[PDB]
Each structure stands twice: as C-alpha cells, then as structure tokens.
Amino acid sequence: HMNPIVVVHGGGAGPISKDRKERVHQGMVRAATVGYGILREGGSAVDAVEGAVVALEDDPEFNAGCGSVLNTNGEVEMDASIMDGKDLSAGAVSAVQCIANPIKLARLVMEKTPHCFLTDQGAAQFAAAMGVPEIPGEKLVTERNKKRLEKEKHELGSVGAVALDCKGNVAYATSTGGIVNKMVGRVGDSPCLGAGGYADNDIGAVSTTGHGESILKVNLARLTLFHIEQGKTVEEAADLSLGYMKSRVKGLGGLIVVSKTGDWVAKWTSTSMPWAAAKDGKLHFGIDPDDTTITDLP
Amino acid sequence: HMNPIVVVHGGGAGPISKDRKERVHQGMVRAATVGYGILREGGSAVDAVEGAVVALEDDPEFNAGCGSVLNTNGEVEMDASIMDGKDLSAGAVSAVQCIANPIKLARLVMEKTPHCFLTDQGAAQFAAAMGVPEIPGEKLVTERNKKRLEKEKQKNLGSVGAVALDCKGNVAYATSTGGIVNKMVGRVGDSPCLGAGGYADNDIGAVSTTGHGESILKVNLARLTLFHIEQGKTVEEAADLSLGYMKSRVKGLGGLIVVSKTGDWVAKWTSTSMPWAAAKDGKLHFGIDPDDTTITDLP
Ligand code: NA
Ligand code: NA
C-alpha cells in the first residue's frame, strides 16, 4: 500500500512580516498535523484535506473562514471546494455568508446532493437544512481586516491541501475569502473545479493559490495535471503551468501537488507561499524560496 | 485573413418531439445567421458568439433566458459565460434572475469589471447598476416548463452556446443555460464555469458544451477537448475522445461544438439529440439527429 502524504498551503501573496511569520509557521504545522493524524490512522484523502483546510478556516491569520478578507461592503463572502480523485465526485460553494467552515459545506454538497456547486442564497439554504449553525458577521471579521479594507479603499490568498491515502486515493480541498474590496458576489477560482484545484486518482491532485482571475482563465490546476499526464516530473509541471500563467495572462501565485505515485512539491511565482508537508513522520515547512525546514512529527 | 465560421448548439439530451422540430430549426437558423451576419460585417468572434446566443436566449424554445427551466420553488435562475480567445479574457454570471439576457450580463463582467465571475445578489446589483433592465420574473416563465416542473414532482434538457472564428483568426465561445429542471436553489452547472461549459484560446480553438452540468464540470470537458487538439487529434477525433472519457469515467452524456484555429469544426454528441447549426463559406449546415444534416445556401 501507499505511503500517505498531506500537503498544505496558505496564500501565494506578497512578502510577510517576520512577526506574522511565526503565527503563520504554527498555523501551517497545525493544519498539516490534523491531516497527517487522520491519514496515519488509515483514514481517507477527503477527510484529511477537509481536516487541514478546516484548521486554517478557524485560524484568523489565514484568508479563509474567520480572518477572511473584506469585500467592498466590509463583509465576508466565502468560497470553497473539495474533490475525490476516485470517482471525481466533487462539491463547492460560492459567496456563502455567516458560517464557520465553508469547506464542510462543500463536502456536504458532495455527499448529500446530486449537484456539485451551490451559491450565495441556495448554499445558505442547504446549510439550514443540514443544520449548519448560522452566526453573525463580526465573528469572522478581524480588526486587521477592517484596517486593510480602508487601505485599498482610500487609495493572504487562498488556502488548501492535497492528499494521498494508504488506499491510494487522492483529494484536494480549497477555501478563501476572495480579495480585498472585491465586488459583491465576486466568485474566485477557489470553487471552480480545474482552476482552484483538481483531483484524479490516475494522476495526482493540486491546490492552487494566487490571482484568481488568472487562475480561472488558464485552468491552472488541471493544466498542472496535463503536464504530468505527458509524463513530466511534478516539479517541471508546476513550473510549466505557473510559467504559462505568468507569460500568458500576467499572473502570479502558487500551488501544491501530489502525484498518484507519492512524489509532491510546493512551488510559486508570487513572492511567498506558506506551505507544509507531512510524509514518513517528517514535516516540511516554509514560506520563501529555498528556505525549507524539516522537523519530526508524531 | 481566414474565412469566418460560427457554430451554434441547443441542448444535448433526449429526442425532440415532432411538434417542436421545426420550431428548434427556426431557432438554430436565426441564431447562426445572426452570428454570421456579425461575421459578415467584419464583426468580432466575441460579438458573434454573443448575438447568436442572445437569439437563443430570446427564443422561448430554448433553455436559456426566456424559456429556461424552473428550479424547485418555481423560479428561473440563469448561468452564462463568454470568453475572448485573444488574451483569455472572460466573464460569467451564475444564478441570475429577472434579467432578459444573462449572456449580455456576462459580457459586461468581462468588459467592465476587475472580475471574471459574479453570482446571485451581486450579479443583480451589477446588472441594475449597469443599466440592465429588470423584467418580471414571470415573463421568463413559460407554459411548457410549468408542466415539466409539476410533472417531475432530474431532466437535463441542456444549454445553448456558440463558437466562432472571426476574420482576424480570433476565437470565442458563449454558453448559456437555465440548467436542470427542479434544481435546488443555487445550483450552478457547467455553463458559467471556464474550462467546462466552454473554453477559448487563439493558440488552439474554442469549444462550448451541453448536457449534464455536473459531469461536464468533473472532467472539464471543454478544456479536455482542446488538450487533445493540442496533441495532434483532429476536432472530430478530440470530440470523440473527450466525450468518450466523460461517458466511461463519470457516465455523463453531452454534446459539444468545436472550431479550430484553422477553421476546422465539428458538432459531436453522445446524447440522443443535440440541435446544432453552422455558418461558413456562404453555407448554412444544420442537424438535430445523427445523419439528418441539411446543407442549404445562405444568401
Ligand atoms: Na481563516
Ligand atoms: Na430562450
């Protein structure tokens, strides 16, 4: 049987201050631990990435769940998606408001409905009948996010995880608040199968982050896979696809990928992308290029 | 300069009833002629795909705008998307109501925002603010469809779209749908979603798709087709393969239309029927079933 692995990422974004790097280090290791945990018990690729993403949704350092950036109206409107490489079963939501964990609801969409994509008010109604707790806006809002909003007015990207399990299934999960002063009801790549992620057992899985208009226009995650189906290393593929994204539509960001045969990589063309990976009891972490650290992980 | 072409498609599903065939014909004809009149007057491919799909939106006989299916509480919710092949520029709208032309609203998203994709109340607000009219939601609601919803109490009647190659060698697609009848509030399918409902790139071509929304999304059918044309596959060979893999892998059935950078084109489907029409070299081709392909002169 396979050796399981989880890979996680934060924003493919600008350079991050070195106090915020510490809470970022700890948050990444956390999400990674919840996913590896579940795996190491022979659990599924789907639950692990869901585990991991959920831990970054509940952390206000990251641009997903609580700590989601604010739209034009200073409100949190969130996107998330999930996919299982075995059946290509999938679930997603756009523009959801007033809940803790948009990624759970994507998973609720994947397994309770014969659809794959619910948005704004219809997602919010599905939530009610699944009894998702509806909570006030402020509980997701951080004082940092109000400040940053007046900055781009008076003139931290997606989060995600990929996994391979001890059975050989892969999955991806993605979630985000979108972007600062985004138009109302703006939908990013994070809920667009192929763009914000893809998962196929006969290939591998990918979670992306960056400029989401760019990402959607090149189908960045499925493109990364196209390079692997042509038999490139995982490294090369990400580099062709990220490299295509730069040269064709002037777009920066990054992605994490795991192929069906065990290998995995975290690459980016933006400045920094927090990331972590947990395989064989070692944990791999980093933010800036060629700055990795390996630790041990129970 | 290349000879321009435009292909249009209706929904890719079960057989049409005799009483509708000539109605569907009249729709496909006017939508293709319209689009090719844009291409006759030096028009852009984006302009060509847009107008051919407005036709279909306007026509009560097709599942988009006027005549879209109803969701489970009896209302119309519409998705559309459009893409410029030159710079990969795009716009999309999901779950929109009470506007007459969603494809037209998708165009404004591409043109007049920092964003590729808008949804729901956001989309209402943006349409309203850009001078798009409000129309009683009752006007998109037709009789044929009321009897489908009550009866269902799900049928995948489909989507309409278009692809075009304009005289400069630019490609484009537009896809629009009312979706699957009886749907949950807020269900979005393949049509607004780039790489699935359609994809356009000057480097390879343009595709638009129809069928079961969820399956086209899963295998990313439009982009998947263009991957194979990249590999050497002809437009017919790639449609075969991309549609075969959706059939084997997820057991979805649909159709597509595709036009290459050279102006090679095909209509292909694995569903029983798919209304399609093309205009090219002063000629108007049209089928619904396999082998019925008529080819009359276009004046
Ligand atoms: Na968060
Ligand atoms: Na119509």
Curated annotation (Swiss-Prot), chain A:
Principal localization reads cytoplasm
Organism of origin: Homo sapiens (Human)
Posttranslational modification: Cleaved into an alpha and beta chain by autocatalysis; this activates the enzyme. The N-terminal residue of the beta subunit is responsible for the nucleophile hydrolase activity.
Where in or outside the cell it occurs: the entry states:
Cytoplasm
Annotated residues for binding of substrate? 186-189, 209-212
Q: What's the EC number here?
A: 3.4.19.5, 3.5.1.1
Q: Name one GO molecular function term.
A: asparaginase activity
Q: In which tissues is it expressed?
A: Expressed in brain, kidney, testis and tissues of the gastrointestinal tract. Present in sperm (at protein level). Over-expressed in uterine, mammary, prostatic and ovarian carcinoma.
Which SUPFAM superfamilies has this protein been placed in?
A: N-terminal nucleophile aminohydrolases (Ntn hydrolases)
Q: Which Pfam families match?
A: Asparaginase_2
Q: Is Acetylation included in the keywords of this UniProt record?
A: yes
Subunit details:
Heterodimer of an alpha and beta chain produced by autocleavage. This heterodimer may then dimerize in turn, giving rise to a heterotetramer.
Catalytic activity of the protein: L-asparagine + H2O = L-aspartate + NH4(+); Cleavage of a beta-linked Asp residue from the N-terminus of a polypeptide
Stated regulation of activity: Glycine accelerates autocleavage into an alpha and beta chain.
Residues found modified as N-acetylmethionine? 2
Identify the gene encoding this protein.
ASRGL1
Gene Ontology annotations of biological process type: asparagine catabolic process via L-aspartate; proteolysis
Regarding protein family, the annotation reads: Belongs to the Ntn-hydrolase family.
Cellular component annotations (GO), alphabetically ordered: cytoplasm; cytosol; nucleus; photoreceptor inner segment
Which residues are responsible for catalysis?
A: 158
EC class, as a word, reads hydrolase
Protein name, per record: Isoaspartyl peptidase/L-asparaginase
Record keywords? Acetylation, Autocatalytic cleavage, Cytoplasm, Hydrolase, Protease
The protein's role, per its UniProt record: Has both L-asparaginase and beta-aspartyl peptidase activity. May be involved in the production of L-aspartate, which can act as an excitatory neurotransmitter in some brain regions. Is highly active with L-Asp beta-methyl ester. Besides, has catalytic activity toward beta-aspartyl dipeptides and their methyl esters, including beta-L-Asp-L-Phe, beta-L-Asp-L-Phe methyl ester (aspartame), beta-L-Asp-L-Ala, beta-L-Asp-L-Leu and beta-L-Asp-L-Lys. Does not have aspartylglucosaminidase activity and is inactive toward GlcNAc-L-Asn. Likewise, has no activity toward glutamine.
Which taxonomic lineage is given here? Eukaryota, Metazoa, Chordata, Craniata, Vertebrata
